[PDB]
Design an enzyme around this catalytic site. Structure first.
Site, PDB file in Angstrom:
ATOM      1  N   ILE A   1     -12.899   5.745  21.794  1.00  0.00           N
ATOM      2  CA  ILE A   1     -11.934   6.612  21.110  1.00  0.00           C
ATOM      3  C   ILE A   1     -11.865   6.415  19.618  1.00  0.00           C
ATOM      4  CG2 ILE A   1     -10.590   6.492  23.204  1.00  0.00           C
ATOM      5  CD1 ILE A   1      -8.801   4.529  22.119  1.00  0.00           C
ATOM      6  N   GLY A   2     -12.698   5.532  19.063  1.00  0.00           N
ATOM      7  CA  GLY A   2     -12.718   5.279  17.623  1.00  0.00           C
ATOM      8  C   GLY A   2     -14.046   4.676  17.248  1.00  0.00           C
ATOM      9  N   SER A   3     -14.463   4.868  15.997  1.00  0.00           N
ATOM     10  CA  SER A   3     -15.655   4.186  15.449  1.00  0.00           C
ATOM     11  C   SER A   3     -15.597   4.185  13.936  1.00  0.00           C
ATOM     12  CB  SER A   3     -16.987   4.774  15.954  1.00  0.00           C
ATOM     13  OG  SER A   3     -17.101   6.151  15.644  1.00  0.00           O
ATOM     14  N   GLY A   4     -16.138   3.129  13.353  1.00  0.00           N
ATOM     15  CA  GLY A   4     -16.060   2.884  11.915  1.00  0.00           C
ATOM     16  C   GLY A   4     -17.408   2.365  11.490  1.00  0.00           C
ATOM     17  N   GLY A   5     -17.431   1.433  10.548  1.00  0.00           N
ATOM     18  CA  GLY A   5     -18.700   0.896  10.069  1.00  0.00           C
ATOM     19  C   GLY A   5     -19.430   0.150  11.180  1.00  0.00           C
ATOM     20  N   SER A   6     -18.916  -1.035  11.495  1.00  0.00           N
ATOM     21  CA  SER A   6     -19.464  -1.867  12.557  1.00  0.00           C
ATOM     22  C   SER A   6     -18.556  -1.857  13.790  1.00  0.00           C
ATOM     23  CB  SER A   6     -19.620  -3.288  12.039  1.00  0.00           C
ATOM     24  OG  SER A   6     -20.480  -3.316  10.920  1.00  0.00           O
TER      25      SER A   6
ATOM     26  N   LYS B   1     -16.081  -0.285  16.879  1.00  0.00           N
ATOM     27  CA  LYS B   1     -15.770   0.702  17.904  1.00  0.00           C
ATOM     28  C   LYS B   1     -14.428   0.353  18.510  1.00  0.00           C
ATOM     29  CE  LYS B   1     -20.532   1.733  18.761  1.00  0.00           C
ATOM     30  NZ  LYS B   1     -21.765   1.194  19.407  1.00  0.00           N
TER      31      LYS B   1
ATOM     32  N   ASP C   1      -2.447   3.118   0.720  1.00  0.00           N
ATOM     33  CA  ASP C   1      -3.396   4.135   1.168  1.00  0.00           C
ATOM     34  C   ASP C   1      -2.980   4.593   2.557  1.00  0.00           C
ATOM     35  OD1 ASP C   1      -5.724   5.634   0.282  1.00  0.00           O
ATOM     36  OD2 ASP C   1      -6.887   4.645   1.872  1.00  0.00           O
TER      37      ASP C   1
END
Ligand SMILES: CNC(=O)c1ccc(Nc2nc(OC3CCCC3)c3c(-c4ccc5nc(C)oc5c4)c[nH]c3n2)c(OC)c1
Ligand SMILES: C[As](C)(=O)[O-]
Length: 259
Positions: free
Chosen positions: A17-22, A24, A133
């Site tokens: 349900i999510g992912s970014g640089g390295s 999950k 942010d």
């Protein structure tokens, strides 16, 4: 049919349900068919500034999570040289996704959410953390309360390019940053939840938008509404001068949440 040990316990992966640089995130189940979220981070090409920033979010998340249930519940975690696993309460959806869906926004629900956001940001402020942010994707819905899920200490995670609409005007005038900056960003989240768009959503071109944000003579429109108290909270949050802008402790004593 994939699966994960953390500290002994075996969790069956439902979906990602999510992912970014390295990174999950997975919705998962333990043996007992109960739901959790697991954040996996892969440390295999990560330099020490990256590693220290990860070590830092865990340390802070662990500490903060016992002073407020408006911070995400971190159940447990594993950390080696190759990976990180973090097991946490699973939410229904991130605030951003839910704002895009939701056409109408119920006044009482809006107020419960505002309070949730205030309690959270207030918490991190008490322990030295200024996010600066904040945006809706930073918050989860978990049984109709918002919970903070990022602290501005490491790479922002994408729900399976980001906005500049919530960015505070001192962020853009730098380049020592105030906690006020968080008040701006929450101010915008409330503004979306109030009037259905962010203040500068109509200005598609980015450099124009940044200019409008930082320009004192670009007036922000506040249509009249029944909750004349809510209208004031938006007016006090979205002042460009951090000095004249309202504080969180002030916001917590404000009539919008108190009366
Ligand atoms: C289009 N997206 C959806 O429909 C959706 C989104 C989130 C769900 N649940 C969820 N989405 C999460 O993280 C997201 C990915 C980054 C933002 C949200 C978390 C987290 C979480 C994820 C990452 C985190 N990083 C930190 C420091 O704390 C975190 C907490 C805990 N429980 C969660 N539970 C969901 O239900 C399965 C559906
Ligand atoms: C804790 As404050 C004064 O930045 O809202």
């Amino acid at each position: 049919n994939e699966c994960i040990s953390v500290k002994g316990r075996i969790y069956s992966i439902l979906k990602q349900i999510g992912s970014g640089g390295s990174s999950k995130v997975f919705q998962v189940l333990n043996e007992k068919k109960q739901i959790y979220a697991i954040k996996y981070v892969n440390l295999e090409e990560a330099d020490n500034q990256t590693l220290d920033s990860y070590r830092n979010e865990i340390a802070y998340l662990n500490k903060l999570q016992q002073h407020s249930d408006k911070i995400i519940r971190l159940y447990d975690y594993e950390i080696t040289d190759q990976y990180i696993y973090m097991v946490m309460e699973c939410g229904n959806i991130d605030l951003n996704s839910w704002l895009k869906k939701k056409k109408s926004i119920d006044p009482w629900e809006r107020k419960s959410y505002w309070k949730n956001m205030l309690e959270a940001v207030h918490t991190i402020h008490q322990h030295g953390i200024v996010h600066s942010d904040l945006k809706p994707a930073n918050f989860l819905i978990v049984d109709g309360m918002l919970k903070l899920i990022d602290f501005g200490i490491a790479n922002q995670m994408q729900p399976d390019v980001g906005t500049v609409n919530y960015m505070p005007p001192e962020a853009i005038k730098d380049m020592k940053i105030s906690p006020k900056s968080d008040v701006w960003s929450l101010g915008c989240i409330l503004y979306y939840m109030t009037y259905g768009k962010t203040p500068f959503q109509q200005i598609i071109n980015q450099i124009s938008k940044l200019h409008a944000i930082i320009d004192p003579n670009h007036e922000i429109e506040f249509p009249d509404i029944p909750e004349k108290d809510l209208q004031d909270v938006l007016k006090c949050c979205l002042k460009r001068d951090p000095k004249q802008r309202i504080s969180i402790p002030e916001l917590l004593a404000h009539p919008y949440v108190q009366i």
